[PDB]
Structures are given as C-alpha cells and as structure tokens.
C-alpha cells in the first residue's frame, strides 16, 4: 500500500540527448507521499538527478526524513549502473535533493558505455522514508 516505508521505482527519459528542460516522473507513493524523479541537463556537460517529495502540496507544515539510492541503470550490465546515496529531511522549502552533477553528460550519452539505448536512459530511486510529520495528524 501507499503507506509503505520504502520502494523502488524507475523513470525512462526519452530523446535524452535532446533534453533541454527539467523532466519529472509520475509519482511513487511512500508513506502516502508522492515521490518523483527529477532529471535535467546542468553545466550537456552533466546530468542533474534529484529525488523530489510532496512538491505539489500547498502545506508548509510537513516534513519527512529519508535516505535513498539514486541510480542510472546500465542496461548491458547492472554492475555497471552508477548510483549515489542521499540522506535528507524533506520539507516545503527543500522538497528535492540529489546531485546537479550526478554524472558526466558525455559518459551517460556514450553509446559504448551501456547507459543509453535508442536515446533513452533509465533512472531509478530506492527510497526509505521515516514516518512524516505535519501531514496525517
């Protein structure tokens, strides 16, 4: 159920080499809150990859601490997938967290590396969140 304390979800960015604006994945519910993958080009140059939480809510009283593993899937060999971990207290003023320079744009888009296929790159997040505060009183 959505009240689960953790989950793993993926989002495949298409026409990746042409990415020019920030993109958002559909939500994955954990602790009944919507979590989304956020991807964006940063400085071509680097791939920005962040985890977002409950960003559309108007509430300013919520907070949810969580740890997560952000990974870009290598479709040829999982062991070659690149990941980084985060630990963050998500709340309305800091509703997303990750790396603006998760990895080199030239590397991810390199056809010989195995991260991109048919100009698509799959992002994955394994999030483990604690019970939130200021949400379900």
């Amino acid at each position: 159920t959505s009240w689960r304390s953790e989950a793993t979800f993926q989002f495949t960015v298409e026409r990746f080499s042409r990415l020019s604006e920030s993109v958002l994945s559909p939500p994955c519910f954990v602790r009944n809150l919507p979590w989304k993958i956020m991807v964006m080009p940063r400085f071509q140059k680097s791939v920005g990859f962040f985890l977002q939480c409950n960003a559309e809510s108007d509430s300013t009283s919520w907070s949810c601490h969580a740890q997560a593993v952000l990974k870009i899937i290598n479709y040829r060999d999982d062991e070659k997938s690149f990941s980084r971990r985060i630990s963050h207290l998500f709340f309305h003023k800091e509703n997303d967290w990750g790396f603006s320079n998760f990895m080199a744009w030239s590397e991810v888009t390199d056809p010989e590396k195995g991260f991109i296929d048919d100009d698509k790159v799959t992002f994955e997040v394994f999030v483990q969140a604690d019970a939130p505060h200021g949400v379900a009183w």
Partner: peptide, 6 residues
Amino acid sequence: EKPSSS
C-alpha cells in the same frame, strides 16, 4: 560530488 536541491 556534494548533494543539494535542484
């Protein structure tokens, strides 16, 4: 790499 918000 240091983490941060977007």
